[PDB]
Every structure is written in structure tokens, then in C-alpha cells.
Amino acid sequence: MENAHTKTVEEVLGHFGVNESTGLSLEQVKKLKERWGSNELPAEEGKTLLELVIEQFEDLLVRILLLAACISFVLAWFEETAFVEPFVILLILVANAIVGVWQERNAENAIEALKEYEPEMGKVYRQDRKSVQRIKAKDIVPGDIVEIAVGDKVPADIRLTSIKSTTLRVDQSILTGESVSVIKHTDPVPDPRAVNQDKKNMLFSGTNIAAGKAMGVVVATGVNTEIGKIRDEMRTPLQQKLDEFGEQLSKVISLICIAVWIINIGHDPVHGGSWIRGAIYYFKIAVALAVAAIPEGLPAVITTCLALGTRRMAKKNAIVRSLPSVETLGCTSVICSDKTGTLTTNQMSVCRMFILDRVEGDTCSLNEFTITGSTYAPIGEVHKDDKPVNCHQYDGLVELATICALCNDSALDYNEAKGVYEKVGEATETALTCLVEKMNVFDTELKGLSKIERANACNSVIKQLMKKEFTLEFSRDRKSMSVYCTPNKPSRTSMSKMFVKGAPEGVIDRCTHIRVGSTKVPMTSGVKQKIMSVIREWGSGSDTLRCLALATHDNPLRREEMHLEDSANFIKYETNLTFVGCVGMLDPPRIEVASSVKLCRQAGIRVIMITGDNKGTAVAICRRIGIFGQDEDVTSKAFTGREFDELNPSAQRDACLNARCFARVEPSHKSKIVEFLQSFDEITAMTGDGVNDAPALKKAEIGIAMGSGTAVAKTASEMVLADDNFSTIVAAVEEGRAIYNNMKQFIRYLISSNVGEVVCIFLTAALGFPEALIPVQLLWVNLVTDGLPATALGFNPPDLDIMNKPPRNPKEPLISGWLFFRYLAIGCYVGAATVGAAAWWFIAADGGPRVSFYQLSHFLQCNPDFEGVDCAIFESPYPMTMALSVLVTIEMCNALNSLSENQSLLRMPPWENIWLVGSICLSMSLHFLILYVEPLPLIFQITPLNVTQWLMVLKISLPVILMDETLKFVARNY
Ligand SMILES: Nc1ncnc2c1ncn2[C@@H]1O[C@H](COP(=O)(O)OP(=O)(O)CP(=O)(O)O)[C@@H](O)[C@H]1O
Numbered sequence: 001m002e003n004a005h006t007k008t009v010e011e012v013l014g015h016f017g018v019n020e021s022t023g024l025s026l027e028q029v030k031k032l033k034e035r036w037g038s039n040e041l042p043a044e045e046g047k048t049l050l051e052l053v054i055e056q057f058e059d060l061l062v063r064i065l066l067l068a069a070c071i072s073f074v075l076a077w078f079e080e081t082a083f084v085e086p087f088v089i090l091l092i093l094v095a096n097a098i099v100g101v102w103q104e105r106n107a108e109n110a111i112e113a114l115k116e117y118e119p120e121m122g123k124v125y126r127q128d129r130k131s132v133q134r135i136k137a138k139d140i141v142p143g144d145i146v147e148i149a150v151g152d153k154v155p156a157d158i159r160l161t162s163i164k165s166t167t168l169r170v171d172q173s174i175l176t177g178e179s180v181s182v183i184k185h186t187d188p189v190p191d192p193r194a195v196n197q198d199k200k201n202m203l204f205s206g207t208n209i210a211a212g213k214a215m216g217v218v219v220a221t222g223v224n225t226e227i228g229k230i231r232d233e234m235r236t237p238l239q240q241k242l243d244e245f246g247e248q249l250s251k252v253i254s255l256i257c258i259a260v261w262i263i264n265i266g267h268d269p270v271h272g273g274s275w276i277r278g279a280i281y282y283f284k285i286a287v288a289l290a291v292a293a294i295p296e297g298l299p300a301v302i303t304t305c306l307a308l309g310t311r312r313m314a315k316k317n318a319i320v321r322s323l324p325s326v327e328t329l330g331c332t333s334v335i336c337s338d339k340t341g342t343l344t345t346n347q348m349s350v351c352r353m354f355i356l357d358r359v360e361g362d363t364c365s366l367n368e369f370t371i372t373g374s375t376y377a378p379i380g381e382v383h384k385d386d387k388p389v390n391c392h393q394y395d396g397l398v399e400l401a402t403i404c405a406l407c408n409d410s411a412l413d414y415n416e417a418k419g420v421y422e423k424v425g426e427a428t429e430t431a432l433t434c435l436v437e438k439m440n441v442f443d444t445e446l447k448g449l450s451k452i453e454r455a456n457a458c459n460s461v462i463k464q465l466m467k468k469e470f471t472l473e474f475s476r477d478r479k480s481m482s483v484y485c486t487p488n489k490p491s492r493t494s495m496s497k498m499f500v501k502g503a504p505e506g507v508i509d510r511c512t513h514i515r516v517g518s519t520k521v522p523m524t525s526g527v528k529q530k531i532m533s534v535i536r537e538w539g540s541g542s543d544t545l546r547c548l549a550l551a552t553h554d555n556p557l558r559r560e561e562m563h564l565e566d567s568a569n570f571i572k573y574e575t576n577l578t579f580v581g582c583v584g585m586l587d588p589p590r591i592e593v594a595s596s597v598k599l600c601r602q603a604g605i606r607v608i609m610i611t612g613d614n615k616g617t618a619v620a621i622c623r624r625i626g627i628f629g630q631d632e633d634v635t636s637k638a639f640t641g642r643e644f645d646e647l648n649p650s651a652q653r654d655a656c657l658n659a660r661c662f663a664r665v666e667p668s669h670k671s672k673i674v675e676f677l678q679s680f681d682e683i684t685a686m687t688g689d690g691v692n693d694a695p696a697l698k699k700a701e702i703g704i705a706m707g708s709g710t711a712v713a714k715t716a717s718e719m720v721l722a723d724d725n726f727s728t729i730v731a732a733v734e735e736g737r738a739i740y741n742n743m744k745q746f747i748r749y750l751i752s753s754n755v756g757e758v759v760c761i762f763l764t765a766a767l768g769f770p771e772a773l774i775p776v777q778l779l780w781v782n783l784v785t786d787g788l789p790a791t792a793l794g795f796n797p798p799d800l801d802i803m804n805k806p807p808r809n810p811k812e813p814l815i816s817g818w819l820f821f822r823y824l825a826i827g828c829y830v831g832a833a834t835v836g837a838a839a840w841w842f843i844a845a846d847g848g849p850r851v852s853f854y855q856l857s858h859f860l861q862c863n864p865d866f867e868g869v870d871c872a873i874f875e876s877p878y879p880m881t882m883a884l885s886v887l888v889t890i891e892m893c894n895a896l897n898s899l900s901e902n903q904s905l906l907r908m909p910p911w912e913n914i915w916l917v918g919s920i921c922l923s924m925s926l927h928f929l930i931l932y933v934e935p936l937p938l939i940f941q942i943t944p945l946n947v948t949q950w951l952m953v954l955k956i957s958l959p960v961i962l963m964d965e966t967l968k969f970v971a972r973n974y
């Protein structure tokens, strides 16, 4: 069937043979799942193996190294060994690129294993249950009645059949781009070619509900769904700080490497007088040194790390849906957080309640009761004085129960697979449903009721006696909700009424009378305080009760007189109200929450609670959690909304740096509160479960949503805790601080090692020593030192003291002033200590000719004063092996100083990072290989080192870690 939106409601239901009330039969489903199918999309596009490889080679620093292997391939085509130059530049570009793809792949496998763990549900009306029940989204088929309410994600494609709120509002941005939400209706839109945005009696799979509650008929599932047809269609702040460093570093290399080509312009004797052949060889060196000095693996490591971070986060059950959100989480200096569903288990049960007992003047006693039942199950009982009572004996309790049943958008739903009761709709409203089951104010025989019909059994006895004509949906500005009811019994002594529940402070202002069991009397000021005081110690008490009031309108307007189009008129219609009673709820803090406030205070992160609840309740939970001490003075650290607006901006910006608790706060104020916290240069993260945290979740630099929370809240946030495990946030912060720490050690290794590679070329030129390396050797120390050894730094373990330092400010220079000195001082030695390897053979070593120092400086001059020395000895391949080995081993040793920033090699030993070992062995193996295997030393121009040379190679290398160890000591001891 096509063009559902042009046909009327009666037409679309008769097409499937369903009625709106009872829904779809068990036979009807299996037939339609045959003709249509499971309501899902198949497999995924994912990534082909080649796309991952190609985006790796798209990068400035990797292109230039490809060219230097084309140059080295063009020149090697005229050599009449030079063919190894391009092959060995290709080698380091392929090692560093292989690790990046493996991490990307087996992390991609991790996010999809987590996202598709918990099965999406959908509320339907089928004939096996007289009540609403939630099934898997996939077993929904074109035909069955679907119910949706605020925060819900639309599970299929639905023709609206009746809105239960006065208006219904939808966020269709995923499918239409519409940033703002939209309204809907049930009448038919006749334009049959109408685009999706003008299909206004329709919902679409994938979109969310911004406000209201409705139900409709499913018209298309699976791939025939409006969003499923389009299935085939289709820079972090550190990376930008790193790319600025990537270009500006190559600038000084180009200079240093053009310099290295001008200094040796005089040398040409060994080339055959051809300055055309003389200057070709050094363009090969300026390229070889440029290749060697360039951090080729810098790009491949950044994305390897963010890939590894998403892997570790999915293992902790956190869906990361925005790649820069883990890095940003490191610099977080304040963590705003919702209360009810986020800091709190969101598992409610009414456990206290009261109606009025008698009112005489300013005096008044009240009947308090206690209800048992921690969970949502409708099993439990009602005590007065710790003994059970029949609630039908107290008239005011009968009314209290009427208001909870009829002013309720929610119901209980028995999950026969799990054997529990779950909430259809919102927690608060469910706790009232579960309460009218425990009260049973009409003495109705629940003897033989299935566990399914036990959930909403007594709710229906009330609903049978009252036709609910309309309902003035709950709005977070008037903090209440109303319902228009008319008794099914004829009208003579019974009339219509409104039934009101909401925040007690605001409801009781609009209460001008009080119901005393079966009678009504005017509201006095002595009774208002009996109530507000009971509310106070309910919320400051041990269970930190969350509580609301309940009132009845005894003379409401008529259905016609009421103007229901502007929501600002709802509060006007709930005004001459009669107080009935209050209920007190239950809501434990999540178990791991308290220990997280302690770990964040310790890491320099302020946590602030933003909530809409009572201030008493709010502060009382900050005392349980530990935001406040059990005896702290919260007089300037905790404000309601109105108390923060009635403030001078001098002492209102004073509050935004000290206060740790903002209560009675609307979705705008949370957004404004984050705004203030940002204007003080603080990276804020916001944690929310519900529809009122959505404006605040976008505003924060990181928004974190709860897994069991609404879809409208997950849609607004960069990370999702599938767990509900609040400790993951702190772990996510530790991971983000761990990634930034690891870029610096990578920098500290490549910068310190490779300045030495340059310092030693600008040294042998200064002393007129014979040149120390040939292109094919610099391209070997390049491959062997700057490749897998450097990339392995991305797996360093966290600093032993990583979560006790405060957050670092992103408005810094990447590299400190001291750090720059530390790079040079080590690499200054590295260049020096490898030139002395060539000098050691030439003078002090027993195996080399003890040539005079004068003679080595002017070795070109050889022969009156340089007499006694053979001439060809100066180009022996002995000093070139002796330096190239010291380089690779010095660089290997200096690769171990990059395990931690200042933790010495004893507190953090080299076996905490196993992979950095495997690379140093592989490169030392590769070096040992071209140094000892049969035909290889000829290509690289090296002599196999004997046994005692290495004891002088080591004797020169190990001092490079003794140097940095003393640099590390001065770092932490200041
Ligand atoms: N269906 C409902 N009907 C009447 N009142 C409701 C209601 N749901 C919530 N309220 C009341 O409105 C007040 C403010 O609503 P809001 O949702 O913003 O805060 P909250 O405490 O309910 C959740 P949070 O801690 O995430 O802010 C609540 O304190 C509650 O007393």
C-alpha cells in the first residue's frame, strides 16, 4: 500500500483489519511478517579493505616521502644498490601504515559489537494483552497499533491515528534536516506527491518525539521505510595544533636540508670534475637527511591513538559517536550532571504519603502512611503506625488513588522473559501506578489475576468509573499536569473534575481549599506549613524522598469554554484547587557515583549537579554522594533557579565558580549555566538522561547520555554509556589525558633523536672530518630508528600518578620552553656521541691507525706534514659502520627515555610497554642482518663489527640514558 497520508484514519485501519483499541492478532502478525518481513536494515557498508589504506597515504608528510622514493627511483635508473634507496623509503612508509589499518579495523569491530548489543524495543497493542507491551523493534510489522510518547524513538513508519497530548512534536532532523521540532495532526493531507516535511500526519523511523504522546498504525517497516530508502546515500582540536606543528617543522628541515647542500658545494675531486655529477650526489644527501629528519609516522600515530581510545572505551561499554570527544574529555575542568536519571538509579516507588486528618483553626493533624515495595512490582502493602490498613476506609485515600491513576501517561508492563515489571513511560508516573496497585481503594478481588494483568489491574477499576476526556500535558515551566475527567455514572451528585499533580511548592500556591477525607475547607497558613515541613524532612531525611502534591478541581470550566491552543493557558485552568495529599518517592544514587566525585575532585574536576527537583532533595543527595560534606554550609554553594536570577552579576559570577548544586532549574537554565561555566574558559561536560537535558547536552563541549535514558537525549550527545556506569566518565577522562601524554613522548623521541641525526651531519662538516653517512644509510637509520620503534610509543601505560594532576589548558603552546631545551640537550649529545664513534677508530682505538688529530682535520691534504699515514685508509668502511651503529643504538636507548615524561626508568620499567620492546629488537635484528649476512654489507657500505667494537658502541650509547635520567630527576624534584 502506498500514499497512506492522503487517506483518512478510518481508511488506513480498515486496510489492515485492525481497530485502534485492541490491535493486531497473533495470526495477523505471522502473515504480515511473511508478506513484508522483519523490521530492520541489513548488514552495513562498513569499510572496504582499500579505503582504509588510501586515506592513510593521503597526507602532506607521507606524500613528500613518496616523492623522495620516486626521485631515488629515477636516479637509481641511471646508476651504471641505488634501487634500495626507494625501496627502503617505501619500507618505513608501509610499516607505519600497516599498524594504522589493523587498529582501525579491530576497533571498528568493537564499536559495532557494542552498539548492536541491547535490542531496540517498541510499544505495541496486540491482542494477547489488553494493555500496552513492548516488543523488539524488528517484530513490528505493517499493521499493528504502535504507541509513542516523549523522548521515544519512532520504531517504524506510522500513520498517526490519535494524539493523546494536546499537541505532539517531533524532531525529524535526521531525515529532513529540520533543526527545529515540528507539529503533527491526524487529519489527511491530500497532496499525494507531498514531500516528507509536509506529511504532517506521519512519523518516520529514526526520528524522536520532542513533546506529547500519540498512537498510530504502522504503514511501512524495514527497507520500505522513508529513512531506509536513503540508506545507500553517503578535524580534532589537537590535530589542528599538531598540523600547525607539522608544517612549521618541515620549514626548518627544508632550510637545514638546503643548508646541508650549500656547505659542501666545494667538494669535485672524487666525481670526475663534473659539477653536474658533483652536485647530484648531495641532493641525494639533502633528500636522505630530509627523509631521515621528517616525522613520517606523526600522522599515522595520531589516528592510531584515537582509534585505540575508541577501542578501549567500547570495552568499558561506552559508545563514542564523535571522534574528538575522548580527547576533549581529557581537558575537562568541570562536569555538570543531571540528578534523577543520571546520578540516580531511576528506580522509584512511593514509600510515604499523607492525606489530611482534621483541620481546626491554625492547627491540623494528618494521616501519614508508609508503603512497602522497593521495586516496580505491584506487590506491597500500606502501613499506618507500622500496621496494615484498608485504604478504602479513608475517603481521602480513595481520592489520592483516583488522582494517581487518572493523571498518568504511564503504565506497568510485565517482561515475562526477564520476570520483572518495567515502566511504559516515565519513572515518576510509574511509581504512582505501582502505588495505586498497592492501595486497592475499591477492595477489588485480585485473587486470580495473571502476573500480566496484575500490573494495571486496579488502575482500570478507576478508569472504568471515569471517562478521561482530555489531558493538559505536563510542562516544565508550570511544573504540573492536569486531566479533565467526567464520571461514567450519571451526573446529579457527581460532576466533572480536573485532577492535578505536580511539584508541591507550585501546586499548593494554587490550592485554595483542602480536602479533609470527605469534606472541603479553606486553605490556611498553618496547614501550608504542616505540608511544607513534612516535605522538608522527607527530602532531607535518610532516603532523600522525591515528592509531589495532588489536588482536585471541583468546579472546572466546560469542554467548550476552555481555550486549549496556547499552552500558557493551562496553568490558568488549574487555579481554584483542593489539596488532597502528597506522596514521597524513592530513588537511590547509583552505586559507583560517590567514588567518582572523589576521583574527580582529586583530578582537579569540579562536579556540579543541575536538576529540576526540590532544593532540599537536591542538596540532600549532594551530601550522600559527597559533593557536599554531611555538615558543610551550603548557603553560598547551592541555589535554586529564582535565587540565581535575583543576583548581581558580581556575586552571580561568584556563584558560577563556587556553587556545586543548582536546583529547580528549567532546560534553558541548564544551558545558561553551562554557558557561564564556559565564559570562564572552562571545558564543560554535561551528563543527562532526559528531554530537559537536551538543550544543555548540545551546549557542553562533551555531552554524555545515559544508556537507559531517552533517545532524544542520546541524539544530543557525543558519548553514550550503554552500561549506565558513571565510573566510565572518569575512565574516559584518564584515557584522554593518556593520549595527549603519548603524543609528547613520540615528539620527544623523534625530535631529540633526529636533531642528533642532523647535529652529527653539521658536526663532521665543521671539523672537516670525512663525511659520516651516504644516502642509503640515512635512509636506513630513517627506516630503522623512526619507524616501528617510534610508533610503539602509542601503547605506553598510564603514568603512575596520572589522575592526581589538574586538567591542562588547551590555550598552551604545544611544547614547553623547558621541553624544547630537553629535546636539544639530549639530541645535541646524540649528534656529538655518534661523531666521536668515527673519531674513536681514527685515534684512540687499537685497530685503527693512531692518526694525529691535525691529520684527521686536514685529511684532505695528504704529503710532508701528514706523513706516515696511508692515503686510502680515510675512506675505510670502518668509521661509517661505527657511527651508523652508535646512531641506531643511541636512538634505541633514547627510545626508552620516551616511556614516561618524568617517572624514572625504575618506577616505570621498560616491560610495562611490551610492544616498544619488540620493535627495538626487530630494528636491532634488521641492523644485525645487513651487518653480518653474506651479500648485504656491500650495498650499505658497512664492515661486520667484531666483538669488542660493540662494547665501545654500548659504552657510548648507554650514556644517553644516563643523561636523560638526570634530566628526569631535575624535572620532578622542582
Ligand atoms: N508527569 C509529571 N506530572 C506532574 N509533575 C511532574 C511530572 N514529572 C515531573 N514533574 C514535576 O516537575 C518538576 C520539574 O520537572 P523536571 O523534569 O524539569 O525535573 P525532574 O526532577 O522531574 C528530572 P531532573 O532531575 O532530570 O531535572 C519535578 O520536580 C516534578 O515535581
Ligand SMILES: [Ca+2]
Pocket: 291, 292, 293, 294, 295, 296, 782, 786
Ligand atoms: Ca624520518
Ligand SMILES: [Ca+2]
Pocket: 292, 753, 754, 757, 781, 782, 785, 786, 891
Ligand atoms: Ca631517527
Ligand SMILES: [Mg+2]
Pocket: 338, 339, 340, 341, 342, 689, 690
Ligand atoms: Mg532526569
